[PDB]
Design a protein around this ligand. Structure first.
Ligand SMILES: CCCCCCCCCCCCCCCCCC(=O)OC[C@H](COP(=O)([O-])OCC(O)COP(=O)([O-])OC[C@@H](COC(=O)CCCCCCCCCCCCCCCCC)OC(=O)CCCCCCCCCCCCCCCCC)OC(=O)CCCCCCCCCCCCCCCCC
Ligand SMILES: CCCCCCCCCCCCCCCCCC(=O)OC[C@H](COP(=O)([O-])OCC[N+](C)(C)C)OC(=O)CCCCCCCCCCCCCCCCC
Ligand SMILES: CCCCCCCCCCCCCCCCCC(=O)OC[C@H](COP(=O)([O-])OCC[N+](C)(C)C)OC(=O)CCCCCCCCCCCCCCCCC
Ligand SMILES: CCCCCCCCCCCCCCCCCC(=O)OC[C@H](COP(=O)([O-])OCC[N+](C)(C)C)OC(=O)CCCCCCCCCCCCCCCCC
Ligand SMILES: NC(=O)C1=CN([C@@H]2O[C@H](COP(=O)(O)OP(=O)(O)OC[C@H]3O[C@@H](n4cnc5c(N)ncnc54)[C@H](OP(=O)(O)O)[C@@H]3O)[C@@H](O)[C@H]2O)C=CC1
Ligand SMILES: CCCCCCCCCCC[C@H](O)CC(=O)SCCNC(=O)CCNC(=O)[C@H](O)C(C)(C)COP(=O)(O)O
Ligand code: SF4
Ligand code: SF4
Ligand code: SF4
Ligand SMILES: [Zn+2]
Lengths: 42, 155, 209, 388, 48, 56, 115, 45, 96, 342, 176
């Protein structure tokens, strides 16, 4: 689609080695993906 | 007894050391300009014998005037080490005291006292030139009450 | 003007900037994806990342543009986009007393072209974008850290970088030097949930999913 | 045997304008390249602002260019007000212009006197720092702080001028030109000062434009450009003044430009004193500017709005702006992104000193080591805004 | 204060104190809140 | 302002200007440190009618 | 699109070639770093540290990630060669002050709640 | 009661000088060279 | 009133005092524990109750704009007193 | 555990280690390292000092805010010991002096002061006492120092039977008075040694090993009532050791056999100095003596520590004694000295 | 409008050239500089005799913090936490609960004075004039710990400085 020398790459993007995050805070963390509940007060 | 002579000699040396407190201009941030305002004619830090000094080899007190960053801390410790003794550190402003506005930053050391021992903590953001002058006179009164020769006489 | 509180709207400049945006889009269809004018009369040109040098050179050199000054070059991190990084060029035309904004996009692994050949001012801005966001700039004369400590790991201005980072610095008397340790806070930063559960601006309401 | 002295140091040096590591190699006596190493005062200001409410982020701008506090907060206030689609009241605008010119006097005094002190003329520093102390008194009388007023806010200014402040500002300004005269009696015609500034750090006008220079670094090279005139803000279009223009683009021309800018600042200050209008000093819209404390303690709506403005803050409509002012050090701007909430999504700060110090290597070409001290002084550099 | 004396309050210090830093009268910080979690105390009577 | 006539003349001559009319030290010309109480005006929307917030 | 543009290397072998060049440069630099910074470590220790830093990223398969790792490694090498780093910066690869953290389940259970 | 805020005086403030004022002082170069020459002449005599 | 702990430590107005086994008392040794001796609860307890003759009374804390947000207090309960929720002043209808 | 003494955090500066330690002798060589190791993990450190408070300033950045507390104390006063000891759960005794003064002889600092600290700590109810005697301590020693060290071990075990006695050998470090002592002999020409040092064998130990061993003995529940010998990994003949010291410092090494009696006269002459004598008769005796072997004692490896060799940490001590000619030389340009083993 | 700062060409006649030659050889502008310094030597210095004389301040001056009371002695703070919410540096830590008499009062009120930027936002946010920045500016300490203020410390500051704090507030509250 453009002259950028398209190079074949796997579809498992992994930027962990470039984020600078210490290794403890990658494998041992567990993130939660959610839509926050409505605050029942309002 | 012979403790009177030692007390008098200590008094003399501590009067000479606080009457010629030569500080080192460590102006990192906004606190630097209030310190040169304490330098300015209105307060005239030179009238107390507190001169405008130069390379740490002739400095008696370090004034940490401004934010200390992680990139900058090794240089501050280096020049602190290069000061001949006796040497004192005055932490001026919230940033130098405990991090201040930038306490929760990735690049700011939370207080210069993590890097050097600090004698006087001057609060304010910035402390007024009068507040810094009060801290300097308080440091002078700290020096007046040292008992180095009396400590030695009872060893 | 019986509205002393509302900011006055200037429609002449809005029309002028609209016409110039049409002009720029027509001259460079190959790279211009979108052009828009804000309600406070600021013109933005959205471009493909390939068109950075062509569009910037056109805006600098065209006799009807003459945007000789690079006011600012920064990046914006938007994690919810696959191209998370938004590269923003702010340009000023002294000849026509006008300003223009040029924006493109990139991700963590695609290099943006260095624009130091267009503006010499871009040398430190691109280093700062690389330092704080991790965006690589191909053909940069000297790309390296500018703001962060030597050997600093990570890119702090990314939205997923923690506010206090990962390491602290202190002087250690055993090893006689300043050392780095994992960050511990005697008082952790207190997260505030401030957003109101009621919609403030209906005119910006996104259509429902 | 190429052993070009790579003296890559000098942060503790008193002439380092605070904190600056200079990596320098010399072909004998003359400078071959300059490599400024900055970040020694990078405090993550732009990231911290993302965790602060719009009001909570205002004091951060006092500490960017900590010689020009009120100008920085004026620029930030203008950006936030543009995003909010609100207008500050006329009296607030006149106060903002008056204190911006007072701030320009403060900054120019600091710049010129520290430049001279670095060159070796220590005496003018004290004479003018007395005037700086008096202007600090004006700052403190209006806000309670000598430097970091936090006085100019999105919507206007925090509180009104105290009674008798205009009289004291008039008393100060009517004598200040005599101090500029004494400063010039020591520097302008001195054959040693000119020997240290004439034809030193010459920058071409086109090359100044392409390097992103602004302010005096532009008008030193003869470029006729000033934001206060071409793109006026507040009530600057209603005030009359002159834009001093250089001819040789060297340190001496820039020094003359700064001195004449002090004179024109006095000229603007006179009109601000004579044309200060009555009225309120913040926008009469309690969903942006907090109500008066008397109304807060009496009226339900005022109490609610005080509570919400001081806990959540006002929501800014989504959008991005780049607004710039003619700061005393050049063009100071902010690229402020709003996502619609009460906290800025992104706040990039444009500081003229960043681009100016990026050009130190270019301007120091073929100059001695002592000339780099002058070139740094002529680009007046505060690393609080260089590093942010 | 001779011509315009301050308003009398019964809680205002009647004796001004200077900066007592570096003296045994110096202020030392402490937590002013009470303990949050109460532990279970075992019975003093043995089960056997 | 306490300087003698001769000293004033010497410093006026040395500076080349009459510096006694533009002294850098402040004197009784300053405003009193105690001022009368102010009475600040209200904004344009301090009205009882014709003031709906949707119109401003 | 389906494919992406490279940083430098159009393939994994090119990325490996640049990795080897960077490894060579670092390996030769280590003795000069030990001498110049007056480090209290041995050249074997420093070169083993260089190798262990390289071995952290051995699992990387994306040539663009490898290219960016090489770019950052060359940046670090230039900070070391030009003596922009201090001794404290060079010595931060060796976490001499940090205590040995537990690794087995039992000790981690004893000292706290972290997994 | 009427409003009372910090205001300019009813007649406005007096003019403030801002323009450069470096006075002309001294003798011409001819006078200086004549004096310098005559001084040397009398010294020699 | 400000009392004493069994260890002799002074008890603040929030009721804080370290127990006899708390090592943190070492911070006060060769020093002092800073305690404000004006307990606001005991001070507001000393104020009389105003006998205002209305069902609803208003209190702004005294001094007008220098007090607290003006509030209105109902005085219909004849067993309780109506007290201000800002400054603690108490009000009651005359002699029931 | 008291509720405020429960460990929290991750072992960093802002953590809580559950340790409240009074470190007698914290202002000395060994003291600055155990104080640093205690403040590293977030311990409450009580520092008794008799020196000028200026001399305790290097310990202030060693711990988080409030975690290092400085208090005046008098070695000849039990009330001061009680005051600085009341709230601690571990007491570390590090006070000592390599010379007698007009007010404190070896019996005072090695017998009376440790016994007072042990007895006051037992009375106040501190759970742990760590006492630092010498490896070579001997009731029939030629040295007053070591005879008093033996007497003090007896007295400390009598007053505080659960105490952990630690017996290091000659500790070396950046301010050790062991490597610096031998490296300071270049000022008097050559290096005088009794019997040329060919009969003395030393087993020096590294300061960080001693400090980490003290910390580990604090944390180890099976160190009560125990006696430890903190020796280094290698034994050296004194001639070989001093030769290696001078080779690392790059100073010329020309020893000569000063006899014992002349060396004692030399030491007696130096005792006249009223400021930190350069050497003494007692130091002359203890340098010439060989370190004992006590295989029956647990050591630094029974606390989980690998002893650091001298040939690894000697450059960080001796690089200060090198001239400008050899200031920037690697640690391996000098081959390790010959080791005598058992 | 603009003006030129260095666009004057020197005159090239006998008298002007001789004027410049005399200025070159006889150092006349250097003598003008010496005259300016000599004139400053005979001027009264602007120095004040600190601490016996003090720099002038205003009622708005923002110094050491204090917690205030009503004339009844009751605290003003009703623990709304507005100051803690608005604090730019997050220097204010607050815990509250119902008091034994039912009042809404703080049990913790800490200000990290080394985190504080002394902006005065807390006293603006406060609806009851409870937290203020007082006039005191001479409170330097010899240790870091004495700058981490307590509720007791701040209340003692209020009792210490209320006499002049109240006068300052009366002087400036009509501007607020
Ligand atoms: C060469 C020196 C020649 C003699 C100078 C005499 C002098 O300056 O007299 C002051 C007198 C007044 O000077 P001023 O600056 O106008 O005084 C301003 C106020 O009136 C000043 O008003 P005031 O109320 O401050 O006056 C009181 C003041 C008055 O002080 C004097 O009169 C000082 C006289 C010094 C002789 O005395 C004090 O304050 C006491 C402290 C004195 C300090 C030390 C004085 C000098 C000691 C010299 C060493 C002694 C051993 O000088 C003159 O009238 C001009 C003399 C010019 C001489 C040629 C140029 C030099
Ligand atoms: C022009 C100048 C001409 C010459 C002027 C001479 C003035 C003489 C007056 C006294 C000078 C200072 C003497 C004390 C030195 C400084 C000091 O406080 O030392 C404390 C020190 C303290 O020793 P210490 O042993 O307690 O502590 C050292 C060890 N540390 C730091 C780890 C704790 O005193 C000494 O070292 C001994 C001093 C002996 C007495 C000297 C009397 C004066 C001798 C000269 C006459
Ligand atoms: C005969 C040789 C005696 C050597 C004594 C000695 O080492 O003194 C060191 C010390 C020198 O120690 P210093 O090098 O720490 O310097 C001490 C002086 N102040 C504290 C001011 C820095 O000797 C002296 O001070 C003189 C003591 C008397 C010397 C004569 C003794 C005759 C018996
Ligand atoms: C050392 C002692 C002498 C110190 C210097 C002289 C006194 C300085 C202070 C008083 C004068 C203040 C300035 C002034 O009046 O300037 C007038 C004027 C100012 O001149 P101008 O700079 O305005 O130039 C006008 C005159 N033309 C155009 C011709 C150059 O200067 C003079 O009159 C200087 C005359 C003396 C020159 C120096 C002589 C040195 C050799 C003496 C013997 C050795
Ligand atoms: N260093 C070694 O090679 C060996 C050391 N040890 C033992 O290790 C311990 C620590 O040694 P180290 O740190 O090197 O010794 P230092 O001499 O360097 O420090 C001794 C400490 O004891 C204090 N002290 C000494 N005498 C008195 C006294 N009379 N009253 C009060 N305090 C006093 C000192 O306080 P101040 O500084 O104020 O005088 C200082 O804190 C000692 O018990 C020592 O005998 C055992 C074997 C070998
Ligand atoms: C002086 C003291 C020290 C001071 C200085 C301490 C640090 C010095 C080094 C600093 C840089 C750091 O190593 C990071 C970089 O450069 S990372 C380069 C990419 N790294 C990869 O791993 C790519 C993928 N890897 C493979 O493809 C293979 O696994 C491998 C190549 C490893 C072996 O290939 P082989 O054919 O099996
Ligand atoms: S304490 Fe305040 S004034 Fe001082 S350097 Fe920090 S931010 Fe600037
Ligand atoms: S003055 Fe500002 S920074 Fe300090 S406590 Fe108040 S709101 Fe926070
Ligand atoms: S001090 Fe004022 S703002 Fe802060 S919690 Fe108390 S009442 Fe609210
Ligand atoms: Zn009330």
């Amino acid at each position: 689609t453009q002259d950028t020398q398209l190079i074949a790459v796997d579809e498992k993007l992994d930027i962990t080695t470039l984020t600078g995050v210490p290794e403890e805070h990658i494998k041992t963390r567990k993130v939660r993906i959610f839509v926050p509940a409505r605050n029942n007060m309002q | 007894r012979g403790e009177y002579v030692v007390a008098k000699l200590d008094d003399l040396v501590n009067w000479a050391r606080r009457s010629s407190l030569w500080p080192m201009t460590f102006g990192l941030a906004c606190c630097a300009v209030e310190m040169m305002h304490m330098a300015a004619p209105r307060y005239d830090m030179d009238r107390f014998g507190v001169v405008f000094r130069a390379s740490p080899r002739q400095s008696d007190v370090m004034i940490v005037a401004g934010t200390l960053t992680n990139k900058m801390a090794p240089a501050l410790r280096k020049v602190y080490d290069q000061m001949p003794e006796p040497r004192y550190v005055v932490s001026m402003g919230s940033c130098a005291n405990g991090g201040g506005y930038y306490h929760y930053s990735y690049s700011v050391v939370r207080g210069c006292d993590r890097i050097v021992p600090v004698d006087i903590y001057v609060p304010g953001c910035p402390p007024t030139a009068e507040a810094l002058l009060y801290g300097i006179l308080q440091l002078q009164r700290k020096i007046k009450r040292e008992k180095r020769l009396r400590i030695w006489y009872r060893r | 003007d019986t509205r002393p509180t509302i900011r006055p709207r200037n429609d002449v400049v809005h029309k002028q900037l609209s016409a110039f945006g049409q002009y720029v889009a027509e001259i460079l269809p190959k790279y211009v994806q979108q052009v828009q004018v804000s309600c406070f009369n600021e013109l933005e040109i959205f471009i493909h990342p390939d068109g950075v040098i062509p569009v910037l050179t056109f805006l600098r050199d065209h006799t009807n543009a003459q945007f000789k000054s690079l006011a600012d070059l920064t990046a914006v991190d938007v994690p919810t986009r696959q191209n998370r990084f938004e590269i923003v060029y702010n340009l000023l035309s002294l000849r026509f007393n006008s300003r223009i904004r040029v924006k493109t996009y990139t991700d963590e692994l695609t290099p943006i072209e260095s624009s130091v050949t267009v503006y010499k001012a871009a040398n430190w801005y691109e280093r700062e974008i690389w330092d704080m966001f991790g965006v690589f700039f191909a053909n940069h004369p000297d790309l390296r850290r500018i703001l962060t400590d030597y050997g600093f790991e990570g890119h702090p201005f990314r939205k997923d970088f923690p506010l206090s980072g990962y390491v602290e610095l202190r002087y250690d008397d055993e090893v006689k030097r300043v050392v780095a340790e994992p960050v511990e806070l005697a008082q952790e930063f207190r997260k505030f949930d401030l957003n109101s559960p009621w919609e403030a601006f209906p005119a910006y309401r996104q259509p429902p999913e | 045997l190429v052993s070009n002295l790579t003296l890559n140091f000098g942060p503790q040096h008193p002439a380092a304008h605070g904190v600056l590591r200079l990596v320098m190699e010399l072909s004998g006596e003359m400078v071959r390249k300059c490599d400024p190493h900055i970040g020694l005062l990078h405090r993550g200001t732009e990231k911290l602002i993302e965790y602060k409410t719009y009001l909570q982020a205002l004091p951060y701008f006092d500490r960017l260019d900590y010689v020009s506090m009120m100008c920085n907060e004026q620029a930030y206030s203008l950006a936030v007000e543009k995003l909010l689609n609100i207008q500050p009241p006329p009296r607030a605008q006149w106060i903002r212009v008056l204190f911006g010119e007072i701030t320009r006097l403060l900054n120019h005094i600091m710049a010129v006197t520290t430049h001279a002190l670095d060159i070796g003329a220590m005496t003018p520093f004290f004479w003018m720092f007395e005037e700086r102390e008096k202007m600090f008194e004006f700052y403190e009388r209006v806000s309670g702080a000598r430097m970091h007023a936090a006085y100019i806010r999105p919507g206007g200014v925090h509180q009104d001028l105290p009674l008798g402040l205009l009289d004291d500002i008039y008393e100060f300004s009517k004598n200040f030109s005599f101090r500029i005269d004494e400063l010039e009696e020591m520097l302008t015609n001195n054959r040693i000062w000119r020997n240290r500034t004439v034809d030193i750090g010459v920058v071409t006008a086109e090359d100044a434009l392409n390097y992103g220079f602004s302010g005096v670094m532009l008008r030193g090279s003869g470029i006729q450009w000033d934001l206060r005139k071409t793109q006026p803000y507040d009530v600057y279009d209603q005030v009359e003044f002159d834009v001093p223009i250089g001819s040789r683009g060297d340190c001496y021309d820039r020094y003359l430009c700064r001195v004449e800018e002090m004179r024109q600042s006095l000229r603007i200050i006179s009109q601000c004193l004579n044309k200060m209008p009555p009225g309120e000093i913040k926008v009469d819209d309690a969903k942006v500017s907090p109500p008066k404390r008397a109304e807060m303690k009496t009226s339900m709506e005022s109490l609610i709005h005080h509570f919400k403005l001081y806990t959540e803050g006002y929501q800014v409509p989504p959008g991005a702006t780049y607004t710039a002012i003619e700061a005393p050090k050049g063009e100071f701007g902010v690229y402020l992104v709003s996502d619609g909430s009460s906290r800025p999504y992104r706040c990039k700060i444009k500081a003229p000193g960043f681009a100016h110090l990026a050009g130190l290597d270019k301007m120091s070409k073929g100059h001695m080591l002592a000339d780099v001290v002058a070139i740094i002084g002529t680009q007046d550099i505060v690393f609080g805004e260089v590093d942010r | 204060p001779t011509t315009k004396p301050p308003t009398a309050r019964k809680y205002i210090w009647t004796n001004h104190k200077f900066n007592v830093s570096g003296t045994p009268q110096q202020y030392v910080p402490y937590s002013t809140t009470r303990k949050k979690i109460q532990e279970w105390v075992p019975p003093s009577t043995p089960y056997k | 302002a306490s300087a003698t006539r001769v000293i004033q003349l010497l410093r006026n001559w040395a500076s080349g200007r009459d510096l006694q009319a533009k002294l850098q030290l402040r004197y009784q010309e300053i405003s009193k440190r105690t001022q009368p109480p102010p009475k600040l005006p209200v904004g344009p929307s301090h009205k009882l009618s014709n003031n709906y917030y949707c119109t401003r | 699109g389906t494919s992406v543009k490279p940083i430098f290397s159009r393939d994994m072998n090119e990325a490996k070639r640049r990795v080897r060049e960077l490894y060579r440069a670092w390996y030769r630099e280590v003795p000069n770093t030990v001498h110049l910074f007056q480090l209290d470590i041995s050249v074997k220790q420093g070169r083993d540290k260089v190798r262990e830093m390289f071995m952290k990223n051995a699992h990387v398969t994306d040539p663009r990630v490898v290219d960016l790792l090489v770019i950052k490694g060359k940046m670090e090498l230039e900070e070391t060669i030009n003596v922009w780093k201090q001794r404290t910066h060079i010595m931060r690869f060796f976490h001499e002050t940090e205590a040995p953290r537990p690794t087995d389940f039992l000790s981690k259970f004893y000292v706290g709640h972290d997994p | 009661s009427k409003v009372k805020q910090d205001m300019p005086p009813p007649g406005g403030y007096g003019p403030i000088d801002y323009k450069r004022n470096l006075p002309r002082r001294g003798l011409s170069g001819y006078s200086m060279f004549a004096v310098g020459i005559g001084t040397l002449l009398f010294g020699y005599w | 009133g400000v009392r004493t702990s069994p260890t002799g430590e002074k008890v603040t107005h929030t009721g804080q005092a370290y127990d006899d086994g708390d090592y943190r008392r070492v911070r006060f040794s060769d020093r002092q524990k800073e305690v404000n001796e004006n307990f606001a609860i005991d001070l507001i307890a000393e104020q009389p109750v105003s006998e205002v003759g209305s069902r609803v009374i208003s209190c702004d804390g005294g001094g007008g704009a220098l007090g607290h947000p003006r509030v209105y207090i109902n005085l219909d309960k004849e067993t309780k007193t109506g007290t201000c929720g800002y400054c603690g002043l108490q009000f009651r209808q005359p002699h029931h | 555990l008291h509720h405020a003494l429960i460990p929290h955090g991750k072992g960093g500066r802002s953590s809580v280690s559950g340790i409240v330690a009074t470190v007698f002798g914290a202002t000395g060589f060994l003291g600055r390292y155990v104080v640093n190791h205690l403040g590293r993990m977030g311990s409450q450190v009580i520092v008794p000092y008799r020196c000028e408070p200026y001399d305790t300033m290097h310990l202030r950045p060693m711990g988080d805010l409030g975690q290092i507390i400085f208090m005046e104390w008098n070695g000849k006063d039990k009330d001061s010991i009680r005051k600085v000891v009341e709230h601690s759960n571990v007491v570390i005794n590090l006070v000592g002096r390599e010379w007698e003064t007009k007010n404190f002889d070896f019996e005072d600092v090695f017998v009376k002061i440790p016994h007072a600290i042990a007895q006051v700590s037992k009375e106040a109810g501190v759970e742990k006492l760590i006492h630092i005697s010498h490896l070579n301590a001997d009731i029939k020693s030629p040295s007053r120092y070591l005879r008093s060290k033996a007497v003090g071990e007896k007295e400390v075990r009598a007053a505080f039977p659960e105490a952990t006695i630690i017996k290091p050998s000659d500790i070396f470090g950046r301010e050790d008075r062991f490597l610096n002592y031998f490296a300071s002999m270049r000022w008097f020409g050559g290096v005088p040694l009794i019997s040329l040092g060919k009969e003395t064998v030393k087993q020096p130990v590294y300061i960080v090993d001693v400090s980490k061993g003290i910390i580990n003995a604090i944390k180890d529940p099976d160190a009560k009532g125990k006696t430890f010998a903190f020796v280094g990994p290698n034994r050296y003949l004194l001639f070989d050791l001093v030769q290696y010291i001078f080779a690392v410092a790059y100073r010329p090494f020309l020893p000569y056999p000063l006899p014992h009696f002349a060396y004692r006269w030399v030491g007696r002459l130096f005792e006249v100095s009223p400021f930190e004598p350069w050497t003494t008769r007692d130091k002359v005796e203890r340098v010439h003596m060989s370190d004992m072997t006590l295989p029956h004692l647990p050591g630094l490896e029974d606390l989980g520590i690998q002893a650091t060799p001298l040939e690894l940490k000697a450059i960080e001590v001796l690089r200060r004694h090198r001239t400008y000619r050899w200031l920037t030389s690697e640690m391996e340009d000098v081959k390790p000295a010959k080791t005598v083993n058992i | 409008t603009y003006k030129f700062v260095n666009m004057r060409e020197p005159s090239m006649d006998m008298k002007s050239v001789t004027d410049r030659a005399a200025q070159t050889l006889l150092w006349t502008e250097l003598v003008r500089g010496l005259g300016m310094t000599l004139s400053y030597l005979f001027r009264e210095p602007a120095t004040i005799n600190y601490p016996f004389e003090k720099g002038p301040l205003s009622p708005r001056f923002r110094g050491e913090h204090a917690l205030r009371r009503y004339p009844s002695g009751e605290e003003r703070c009703i623990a709304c936490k507005l100051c803690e919410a608005v604090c730019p540096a997050q220097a204010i830590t607050i815990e509250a609960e119902p008091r034994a008499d039912g009042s809404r009062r703080t049990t913790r009120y800490d200000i990290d004075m080394t985190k504080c930027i002394y902006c005065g936002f807390c006293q603006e946010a406060c609806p009851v004039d409870a937290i203020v920045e007082g006039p005191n500016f001479e409170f330097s300490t010899e240790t870091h710990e004495e700058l981490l203020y307590n509720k007791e410390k701040l209340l003692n500051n209020g009792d210490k400085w209320e006499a002049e704090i109240a006068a300052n507030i009366q002087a400036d509250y009509l501007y607020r």
